[PDB]
Structures are given as C-alpha cells and as structure tokens.
C-alpha cells in the first residue's frame, strides 16, 4: 500500500532475479588479465604498433553527432585505389580495410 506522497514505482523483481545476479568481484583480475594479454601481444609484434592498424577518419552517422569525427573500421576501396595501394597488400602493411564502405563526399 502506498503511504502519502511518493513516486509510483515498478520494480522488476517479480521474476526470480536471485538466480541470475552478475557479481563483479573478478573485475580487477579481469583488468590484470587484459593488461597482461595486451603486454604479451605488443611484445610479440615488436616494431609494429601495439594498438593496431591505422583506422580511417570517419564522421558520425546521426544528426546528434554528425559534427564530430571518430575512427572508422577501415579505409575504403576507393581510398586505397587513389592512394595507389593494393587492397591485398594494405592489410599486410598494417592498414585496416573496410570493403563494405562507400564514399559519398
């Protein structure tokens, strides 16, 4: 029963949520494992960049973010063509390629 003023609340705890609860006690261990794997991979590829291949300059899709620019999946086929790079050699030299992206501007 409600008592005096207060928000009308709808808790979603009618469905035996106790059996499916995600506890995050292994969060710092997960962070350490991720860091160690990062260091191991960077050690494995010694002169190459540790982060990964160069990603393209890409504008954000919707009207909320189109003023902003982020990184894309890979350089387009047309970009590679006019840059003079074979699309099967770009990936080996460390360039991400996104075949399914077409240019409009």
């Amino acid at each position: 029963a409600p008592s005096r003023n207060g928000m009308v609340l709808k808790p979603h705890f009618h469905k035996d949520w106790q059996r499916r609860v995600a506890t995050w006690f292994n969060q710092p261990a997960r962070k350490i494992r991720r860091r160690k794997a990062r260091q191991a991979k960077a050690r494995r590829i010694a002169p190459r960049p540790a982060s990964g291949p160069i990603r393209p300059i890409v504008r954000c899709p919707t009207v909320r973010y189109h003023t902003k620019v982020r990184a894309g999946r890979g350089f387009s086929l047309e970009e590679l063509r006019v840059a003079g790079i074979h699309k099967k050699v770009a990936r080996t030299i460390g360039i991400s390629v996104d075949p399914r992206r077409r240019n409009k501007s």
């Binding site: 949520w17 499916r20 609860v21 995600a22 506890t23 995050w24 006690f25």
Partner: protein
C-alpha cells in the same frame, strides 16, 4: 502440426494452455528429417538437405551426409572443418541451414530476439542483474 501429447486431451491448468490441436512444432519438417537421419547415422555428419517430393501425409527430403573419417574427406582441405569434434550432430543443435531458420538468426530490426547468439543468450543477458562492485 504437432498435437500436444496429453491423455484424453486434458491439460490441467488455465484455459490459455488448453489447446491440443492447431499447435505447431517450432522446427520445420526438413530439420526433423535431418535430425532423424543424423540420429540413425550418428557415425556421419549432416551437411544439408533438400526437398524432393510430397503428398498429403508425407514429405520427402534427401539429406547429405559426410563420413568424417574417410581419407578423401580428412586429407582434403575446405572439408576438414566438418571433421572437427565441435561439428558433431549439428542437426540436433540446429546448425544446418534448415535448423538455423527456426532460430530466428539474422541481422536487422526483425531479429532483436537473438542478439548475443540465441534467444536464450539474449534473454539471459537482458534478465541478469549486473551488480557492480561500486554502487
């Protein structure tokens, strides 16, 4: 369709679950045929199947099976994947083309049920309460 197997048509419960007839099995007859072929010939791996004919009461499917231990399969790449242990009895787990259709797997606004790998995967991920360490 799949008639519900209850004695004398009695489903003791609320009238919403009183249906016996007009019920449909959630997997297609083609996937059923693939399941039966694989279950009988468990030593083989089901690849795919195709419709070959039907009458009023029966449907006929021809099913392609691969012997995972024949040397013509094991020494040939591009088919070595079917011999991997994780690829056994795929039809019982719905990995064939026919068995995959019933799962609702795909891309688009139409397929928001199977985000994460499967319906149960999505349901788990959505209905699990993520209790962080810091709240």
């Amino acid at each position: 369709g799949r008639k519900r197997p209850v004695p004398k048509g009695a489903t003791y419960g609320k009238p919403v679950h009183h249906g016996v007839n007009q019920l449909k099995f959630a997997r297609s007859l083609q996937s059923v045929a693939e399941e039966r072929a694989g279950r009988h010939c468990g030593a083989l791996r089901v690849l795919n199947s195709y419709w070959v004919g039907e009458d009023s009461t029966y449907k006929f499917f021809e099913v392609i099976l691969i012997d995972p231990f024949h040397k013509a399969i094991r020494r040939n790449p591009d088919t070595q994947w079917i011999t991997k242990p994780v690829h056994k009895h795929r039809e019982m787990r719905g990995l064939t083309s026919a068995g995959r259709k019933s799962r609702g797997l795909g891309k688009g606004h139409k397929f928001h049920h199977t985000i994460g790998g499967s319906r149960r995967a999505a349901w788990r991920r959505r209905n699990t309460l993520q209790l962080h360490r810091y709240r």
